[PDB]
Amino acid sequence: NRIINHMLIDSLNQLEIRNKICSSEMINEQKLPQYIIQGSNTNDNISIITLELESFLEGSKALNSILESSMFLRIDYSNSQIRLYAKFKRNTMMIQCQIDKLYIHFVQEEPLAFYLEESFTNLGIIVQYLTKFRQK
Numbered sequence: 001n002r003i004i005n006h007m008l009i010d011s012l013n014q015l016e017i018r019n020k021i022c023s024s025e026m027i028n029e030q031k032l033p034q035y036i037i038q039g040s041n042t043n044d045n046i047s048i049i050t051l052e053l054e055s056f057l058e059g060s061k062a063l064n065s066i067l068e069s070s071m072f073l074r075i076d077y078s079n080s081q082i083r084l085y086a087k088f089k090r091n092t093m094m095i096q097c098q099i100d101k102l103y104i105h106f107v108q109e110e111p112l113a114f115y116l117e118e119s120f121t122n123l124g125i126i127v128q129y130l131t132k133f134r135q136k
Contacts, residue, residue: 018055022048
């Protein structure tokens with residue numbers, strides 16, 4: 001798991017995307033959003049990485065005022081699921097509209113927090129998945 005996290009870090013560096021590891025101490029400190037910690041029952045198959053909004057968008061500064069500068073990529077190997085969690089900087093009324101057709105699930109605990117969920121089979125192509133997330 002540590003090597004998988006490190007190779008994801010190296011791949012993001014090849015994409016020139018800044019990142020930080022949500023280690024065991026980081027998760028235990030409860031500084032991360034609680035809904036992300038939810039479902040992580042001390043399982044080594046769940047990895048959370050904090051990404052910069054500017055870095056993940058390759059310098060798109062027009063989207064900094066809409067989404068928070070920090071996003072969270074949670075990967076579950078047991079579920080083989082990739083979730084990109086983002087937090088709205090301001091409460092937009094467009095959340096009240098139905099966005100179910102865009103495969104965006106809003107966090108019940110945090111209405112300003114939403115996420116994109118996808119299923120992956122090969123980790124080597126995860127970059128494309130990220131772009132897909134980015135596309136959405």
